[PDB]
Design a binder for this molecule. Structure first.
Ligand SMILES: *[C@@H]1O[C@H](CO)[C@@H](O)[C@H](O)[C@H]1NC(C)=O
Ligand SMILES: *[C@@H]1O[C@H](CO)[C@@H](O)[C@H](O)[C@H]1NC(C)=O
Ligand SMILES: *[C@@H]1O[C@H](CO)[C@@H](O)[C@H](O)[C@H]1NC(C)=O
Ligand SMILES: *[C@@H]1O[C@H](CO)[C@@H](O)[C@H](O)[C@H]1NC(C)=O
Ligand SMILES: *[C@@H]1O[C@H](CO)[C@@H](O)[C@H](O)[C@H]1NC(C)=O
Ligand SMILES: *[C@@H]1O[C@H](CO)[C@@H](O)[C@H](O)[C@H]1NC(C)=O
Lengths: 209, 347, 223
């Protein structure tokens, strides 16, 4: 039986103490215990807390677990940075049935800015009777922005798709914005804005022959 | 006085030395004659805790039969790990005899005599013994055969009721006959087993009625094995050295129960079975090929005394629990007999 | 000790085949729960595959659809699933447990996990590319950028290089957006100075597998 309910976690700071539960529809002793996990690229998602055992070989002490109620509490006194990753609860559900999992939480965590870049459709594409716009998104922090295309002085209401931020190498973020145009419309409407907002002090370079 | 302990037991038998039948010769050589007057004194108002799942006696029997099988039943061919095995593959004389397991000094065997004992936990009516009762090393899958019966109710035994991964052993209070035959003198490997449908569906009707009491009057469901090898998925067994794999699909006929005077579900049941010479040993030890069958009339008749079961996962159905035949393994065969016993060290 | 591995894309409606090779001992007494991942979220029990016997289990919810598989000897596994769907793009996993059934430790838990077995499920078939040359704004700011227009290709992924990979300054292999109809739009840029030009022109670099389509299309600012 049993369910689960988790808030995303957490826009923390590189050190402060945090305490996150893995609470199930069993709001009783359940989840009686849990495994919380690391979960990385090319890596095994790597478990943190065992029950019926401590931390295995090759594991350090700073992770303690304690509950009461359904009030579980995965606790960090000393936050760490490569906690800039994803963490999930694992269910016993009475050794079944059946075993559930948590909502996942990540902590990498009011001021701009990116270096913004905008560019117009290539001729060859217009030689292909098509046209492709690029409003790129780059060199900002955090990877949390609100994209806004506009008709220079008026709204834009379509032709557009927002990514999941797919960060740069520099741990400052990366993203790309693109607008849908008819070649007719590409050159029917004089100018197309692309205000990707990073902490609302949003500057843009636009394109208009 | 004592404390829970594990130690190595010995075996006893009335095995006959001239029989070449392997159990006779073996027990003739590996086990001893019986004690004609073994003593048992009951201790008044004493309660003791048990754990049927850890009695190395099991480990000893499994190990022993395995060692035997590994050294006695050379197939014409064995495929194992990185090696390849070839040979002549000869005929044998085969017929199990009862085996008793008995304890040495400084240890004793404790027995739960609680008629309704589940195999773990306290037993109010406990006795002590020097040697066990006679246990047939009945090798079977799905079903436990020719075992001891519960003296009162059919008993359900399991390591973790919540865990569908834990095998359920069903202890019968009534034996059920299965009659398997390759008739004298065309498929030379074709055989069949006849079973009485009525006895089975009746006891089983009773078991279901009983199961609901444990499953909140929830719907009780049987399902076919999800899949797998014939070796694990079928009732697999040996008669005079020849290997049977029998399909138990027909048995979980849900429609055949409700006391509804009905068709299909009736009469003497004749189930078709077939034989395979080549198998993967469940010991995980590889593959075996044995030589071909005898001329003539082939027959093995058995009493059914126990069952191994696997449960379907998938909670929140809230009305039903779903089950599929097949449970653990032969250790359960020895376990099904052992729920009331444990070895202790005398201190 | 534990390597999952699989290929990415096939069309929906069909069926599939999945591995996870591990250590023999881990195959001795540990069933392996297959679970799956979704874009950035927490796991799903699909079923269990025992190390022994091959007694299979997974939820009844595939009764007509399912089959489970393995290899005892070769220390290796297979899974197979029916009814693929265009929306079914994400990573799968395998996990063990001593299970109060291994050692005298007696714990049940997902000890080690899979590297992940990627998925990319598209009804669309392999696709010939739409490549285009991004006229950079030829143009204080004595330093500018150009890149390529990665359009209309299928399936994943795209390779990017510059000066045959020799170029990396401000070079950035930018994200793909597998856009609605199913065309990823991937990007890459590279930054250049006011001083290098007249000789210094620049290209984006790709090879599309199911078509063996090796593209290097010249990016120019317009006539
Ligand atoms: C079980 O209980 C009855 C009633 O007290 C007793 O006569 C019997 O001896 C007990 N069984 C054993 C094995 O002691
Ligand atoms: C066998 O066990 C069932 C389970 O309770 C019971 O209903 C039935 O009466 C038993 N058989 C006999 C002959 O008593
Ligand atoms: C078992 O089957 C044989 C024939 O295969 C038959 O002769 C015999 O009567 C059957 N068993 C019983 C108890 O009748
Ligand atoms: C289940 O029971 C019905 C009712 O007698 C019968 O017609 C049907 O064939 C049975 N299913 C089997 C034998 O698989
Ligand atoms: C099964 O056993 C019952 C028990 O009385 C009997 O009435 C019936 O005739 C038997 N059916 C067979 C042997 O097919
Ligand atoms: C059960 O006992 C009978 C009687 O000796 C025998 O013929 C049969 O082979 C035995 N089978 C099993 C599996 O115990």
């Amino acid at each position: 039986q049993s369910a689960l309910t988790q808030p995303p976690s957490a826009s923390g700071a590189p050190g402060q103490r945090v305490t996150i539960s893995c609470s199930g529809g069993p709001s009783n002793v359940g989840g009686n215990y849990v495994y919380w996990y690391r979960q990385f690229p090319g890596t095994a998602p790597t478990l943190l807390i065992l029950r019926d055992d401590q931390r295995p070989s090759g594991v350090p002490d700073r992770f303690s677990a304690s509950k009461s109620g359904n009030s579980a509490s995965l606790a960090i006194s000393g936050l760490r940075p490569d906690d800039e990753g994803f963490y999930f609860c694992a269910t016993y559900d009475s050794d079944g049935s059946i075993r559930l999992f948590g909502g996942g939480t990540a902590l990498t965590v009011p001021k701009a800015a990116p270096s913004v870049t905008l560019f117009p459709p290539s001729s060859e594409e217009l030689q292909a009777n098509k046209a492709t716009l690029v409003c790129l998104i780059s060199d900002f922090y955090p990877g949390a922005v609100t994209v806004a295309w506009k008709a220079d002085s008026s709204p834009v209401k379509a032709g557009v798709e927002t990514t999941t931020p797919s960060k740069q190498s520099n741990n400052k973020y990366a993203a790309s914005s693109y607008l849908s145009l008819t070649p007719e419309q590409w050159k029917s409407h004089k100018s197309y804005s692309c205000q990707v907002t990073h902490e609302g002090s949003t500057v843009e370079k636009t394109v208009a022959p | 006085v004592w404390k829970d302990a594990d130690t190595t037991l010995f075996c006893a038998s009335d095995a006959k030395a001239h029989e070449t039948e392997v159990h006779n010769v073996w027990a003739t050589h590996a086990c001893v004659p019986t004690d004609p007057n073994p003593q048992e004194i009951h201790l008044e108002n004493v309660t003791e805790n048990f754990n049927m799942w850890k009695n190395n006696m099991v480990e000893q029997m499994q190990e022993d039969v395995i060692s035997l099988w590994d050294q006695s039943l050379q197939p014409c061919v064995k495929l194992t790990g990185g090696s390849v095995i070839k040979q002549a593959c000869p005929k044998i004389s085969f017929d199990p005899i009862p085996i008793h397991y008995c304890t040495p000094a400084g240890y004793v065997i404790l027995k739960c005599n609680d008629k309704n004992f589940n195999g773990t936990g306290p037993c109010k009516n406990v006795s002590s013994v020097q040697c066990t009762h006679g246990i047939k090393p009945v090798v079977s899958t799905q079903l436990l055969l020719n075992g001891s019966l519960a003296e009162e109710e059919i008993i359900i035994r399991s390591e973790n009721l919540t865990n569908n991964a834990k095998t359920i052993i069903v202890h019968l209070n009534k034996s059920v006959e299965i009659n398997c035959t390759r008739p004298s003198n065309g498929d030379i490997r074709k055989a069949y087993c006849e079973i009485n449908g009525t006895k089975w569906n009746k006891v089983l009707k009773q078991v279901t009625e009983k199961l609901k009491e444990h499953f909140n009057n929830k719907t009780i469901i049987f399902q076919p094995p999800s899949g797998g090898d014939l070796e694990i998925t079928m009732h697999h067994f040996n008669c005079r050295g020849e290997f049977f794999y029998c399909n138990t699909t027909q048995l979980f006929n849900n429609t055949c129960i409700g006391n509804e005077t009905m068709k299909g579900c009736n009469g003497t049941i004749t189930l078709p079975c077939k034989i395979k010479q080549i198998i993967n040993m469940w010991q995980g030890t590889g593959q075996a090929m044995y030589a071909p069958p005898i001329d003539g009339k082939i027959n093995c008749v058995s009493n059914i005394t126990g069952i191994l079961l696997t449960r379907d996962g998938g909670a929140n159905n809230t009305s039903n629990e779903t089950f599929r035949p097949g449970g653990g393994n032969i250790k359960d065969n020895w376990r099904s007999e052992l729920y009331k016993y444990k070895v202790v060290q005398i201190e | 000790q534990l390597e999952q591995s699989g290929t990415a894309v096939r069309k929906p409606g069909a069926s599939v085949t999945l591995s996870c090779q591990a250590s023999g001992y881990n195959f001795v007494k540990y069933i392996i729960h297959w679970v799956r991942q979704k874009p950035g979220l927490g796991f799903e029990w699909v079923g269990m595959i025992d190390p022994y016997r091959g007694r299979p289990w997974s939820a009844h919810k595939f009764q007509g659809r399912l089959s489970l598989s393995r290899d005892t000897s070769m220390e290796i596994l297979y899974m197979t699933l029916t009814s693929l769907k265009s929306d079914d793009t994400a990573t799968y996993f395998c996990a063990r447990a001593e299970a109060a059934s291994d050692s005298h430790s007696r714990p049940i838990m997902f000890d080690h996990w899979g590297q992940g077995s990627l998925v990319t499920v598209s009804s669309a078939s392999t696709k010939g590319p739409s490549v285009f040359p991004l006229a950079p704004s030829s143009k204080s700011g004595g330093t500018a950028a150009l890149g390529c227009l990665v359009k209309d290709y299928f399936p994943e992924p795209v390779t990017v290089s510059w000066n045959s990979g020799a170029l990396t300054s401000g070079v950035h292999t930018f994200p793909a957006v597998l856009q609605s109809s199913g065309l990823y739009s991937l990007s890459s840029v590279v930054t250049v100075p006011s001083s290098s030009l007249g000789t210094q022109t620049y290209i984006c670099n790709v090879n599309h597998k199911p078509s063996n389509t090796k593209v290097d299309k010249k990016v120019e600012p317009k006539s």
